[PDB]
Design an enzyme around this catalytic site. Structure first.
Site, mmCIF file in Angstrom:
data_model
loop_
_atom_site.group_PDB
_atom_site.id
_atom_site.type_symbol
_atom_site.label_atom_id
_atom_site.label_comp_id
_atom_site.label_asym_id
_atom_site.label_seq_id
_atom_site.Cartn_x
_atom_site.Cartn_y
_atom_site.Cartn_z
ATOM 1 N N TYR A 1 0.892 -1.075 0.111
ATOM 2 C CA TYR A 1 -0.060 -0.039 0.100
ATOM 3 C C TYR A 1 0.985 1.266 0.050
ATOM 4 C CG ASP B 1 -9.306 -1.894 2.237
ATOM 5 O OD1 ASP B 1 -8.407 -2.811 2.326
ATOM 6 O OD2 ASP B 1 -10.274 -2.070 1.431
HETATM 7 C C1 LIG Z 1 -6.453 2.313 -3.238
HETATM 8 C C2 LIG Z 1 -7.494 2.049 -1.948
HETATM 9 C C3 LIG Z 1 -8.603 3.022 -2.077
HETATM 10 C C4 LIG Z 1 -9.166 3.040 -1.136
HETATM 11 C C5 LIG Z 1 -8.866 2.643 0.124
HETATM 12 N N1 LIG Z 1 -9.519 2.745 1.087
HETATM 13 N N2 LIG Z 1 -10.893 2.633 1.147
HETATM 14 C C6 LIG Z 1 -11.409 2.863 2.530
HETATM 15 C C7 LIG Z 1 -12.568 2.857 2.915
HETATM 16 C C8 LIG Z 1 -13.406 2.029 2.295
HETATM 17 C C9 LIG Z 1 -12.626 2.036 4.267
HETATM 18 C C10 LIG Z 1 -13.379 4.341 2.969
HETATM 19 C C11 LIG Z 1 -10.394 3.400 3.140
HETATM 20 C C12 LIG Z 1 -9.246 3.242 2.272
HETATM 21 N N3 LIG Z 1 -8.047 3.761 2.659
HETATM 22 C C13 LIG Z 1 -7.380 3.488 3.853
HETATM 23 O O1 LIG Z 1 -7.787 2.994 4.627
HETATM 24 N N4 LIG Z 1 -6.043 4.224 3.873
HETATM 25 C C14 LIG Z 1 -5.303 4.136 4.983
HETATM 26 C C15 LIG Z 1 -5.145 3.148 5.518
HETATM 27 C C16 LIG Z 1 -4.621 3.193 6.831
HETATM 28 C C17 LIG Z 1 -3.781 4.131 7.364
HETATM 29 O O2 LIG Z 1 -3.546 4.490 8.553
HETATM 30 C C18 LIG Z 1 -3.001 3.174 9.071
HETATM 31 C C19 LIG Z 1 -2.534 3.645 10.487
HETATM 32 N N5 LIG Z 1 -3.613 3.367 11.744
HETATM 33 C C20 LIG Z 1 -4.725 4.310 11.431
HETATM 34 C C21 LIG Z 1 -5.126 4.836 12.636
HETATM 35 O O3 LIG Z 1 -4.199 5.289 13.300
HETATM 36 C C22 LIG Z 1 -3.342 4.140 13.925
HETATM 37 C C23 LIG Z 1 -2.703 3.466 12.712
HETATM 38 C C24 LIG Z 1 -4.148 5.513 6.533
HETATM 39 C C25 LIG Z 1 -3.767 6.732 7.072
HETATM 40 C C26 LIG Z 1 -3.846 7.940 6.167
HETATM 41 C C27 LIG Z 1 -4.547 8.007 5.021
HETATM 42 C C28 LIG Z 1 -5.023 6.488 4.490
HETATM 43 C C29 LIG Z 1 -4.987 5.306 5.276
HETATM 44 C C30 LIG Z 1 -7.838 1.865 0.133
HETATM 45 C C31 LIG Z 1 -7.014 1.784 -0.773
#
Ligand SMILES: Cc1ccc(-n2nc(C(C)(C)C)cc2NC(=O)Nc2ccc(OCCN3CCOCC3)c3ccccc23)cc1
Length: 325
Positions: A31, A156
């Site tokens: 990722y 995710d």
């Molecule tokens: C290509 C792609 C497209 C979409 C996604 N996608 N889809 C969703 C939904 C459906 C749930 C809304 C969410 C995501 N993306 C994510 O969940 N992305 C992330 C994962 C983990 C993270 O941080 C991890 C650290 N964790 C977070 C909380 O604090 C403690 C540690 C993130 C930190 C900053 C920005 C994005 C993060 C993913 C990939």
């Protein structure tokens, strides 16, 4: 354009604005890699995602754009959302890397009151995202952020929590594949053990049919794949199990909500909207604060464009991003 400082975290480099400090590696992988950091502009701890090689292929560049545009539309309490999003390059030419930010929540979801609050928040977070025509498809305990307050957010980052109609591999199921994933999680919370620890797709399927029993003439007449039908029908007929005896000792409203979440026919599975309306979340439900999401455009999902095209489009998203109040 703030001062951006560089720093090599892990095997990676990080060029982020001055406002973010105490950059602490938390996780890396398939990722990009996330670092926990402190936001002096708001005093809050945050999680920052540096997308790997944003545009090294058309799949990378498309995927990039897809994450940015989602998180940019995601505005719900029980769903991860965008605090900030930046990059170190000015002008499209220099645009190479993307960083995302969000509320550092600490810990992953990995007491009847606790499974009550916990699960309620997942369904609340699901109804929303689903209401925008989005299906998580990857729902598992590691994709559920939860702080010490037991406040939970979905994100995710196994097959074990995957729906039956997608172990066999369907080309067009519904949103309730997510509901199955929840039922599997809720079962883990209550018992402590993984409901379906299949070692393989086919294995996993056996596991699942053991509890729910094998399909009926009604369901079977709903599978096109002779292969898929031939695999299921080819398994010893099994009587669905007495969930009561499976989860003995648990609140019978939780047992009842499960029966409705773990149904083989995705056409007869409870939806999120409907789940919230269960008696098991009586202490938490409130139809006036279980919001839906504005309309989400994902017609882009259908096209195949050049990496530079996907790239420009994302560049655009970055610069048009407005931070929350
Ligand atoms: C290509 C792609 C497209 C979409 C996604 N996608 N889809 C969703 C939904 C459906 C749930 C809304 C969410 C995501 N993306 C994510 O969940 N992305 C992330 C994962 C983990 C993270 O941080 C991890 C650290 N964790 C977070 C909380 O604090 C403690 C540690 C993130 C930190 C900053 C920005 C994005 C993060 C993913 C990939």
């Amino acid at each position: 354009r703030p001062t951006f400082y560089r720093q090599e975290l892990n095997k990676t480099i990080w060029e982020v604005p001055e406002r973010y400090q105490n950059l602490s590696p938390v996780g890396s992988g398939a990722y990009g890699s996330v670092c926990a950091a402190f936001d002096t502009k708001t005093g809050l701890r945050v999680a920052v995602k540096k997308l790997s090689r944003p545009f090294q292929s058309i799949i990378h560049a498309k995927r990039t754009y897809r994450e940015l545009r989602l998180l940019k539309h995601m505005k719900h309490e029980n769903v991860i959302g965008l605090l900030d999003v930046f990059t170190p390059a000015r002008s499209l030419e220099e645009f190479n890397d993307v960083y995302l930010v969000t509320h550092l929540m600490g810990a992953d979801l990995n007491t009847d009151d606790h499974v009550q609050f916990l699960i309620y928040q997942i369904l609340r977070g699901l109804k929303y995202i689903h209401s925008a025509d989005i299906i998580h498809r990857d729902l598992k305990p590691s994709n559920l952020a939860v702080n010490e307050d037991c406040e939970l957010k979905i994100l995710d980052f196994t097959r074990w929590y995957r729906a039956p109609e997608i172990m066999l591999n369907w080309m067009h199921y519904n949103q309730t594949v997510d509901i199955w994933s929840v039922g599997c999680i809720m079962a883990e919370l209550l018992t402590g053990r993984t409901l379906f620890p299949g070692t393989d797709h086919i294995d996993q399927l056996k596991l699942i049919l053991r509890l729910v029993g094998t399909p009926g003439a009604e369901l079977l007449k709903k599978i096109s794949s002779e292969s898929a039908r031939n695999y299921i029908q080819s398994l010893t007929q099994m009587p669905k199990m007495n969930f009561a005896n499976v989860f003995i000792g648990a609140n019978p409203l939780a047992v009842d909500l499960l029966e409705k979440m773990l149904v083989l026919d995705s056409d007869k599975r409870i939806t999120a909207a409907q789940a919230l309306a269960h008696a098991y979340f009586a202490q938490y439900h409130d139809p006036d604060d279980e919001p839906v999401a504005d309309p989400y455009d994902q017609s882009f999902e259908s096209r195949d464009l050049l990496i530079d095209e996907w790239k420009s489009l994302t560049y655009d998203e970055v610069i048009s991003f407005v931070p929350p109040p």
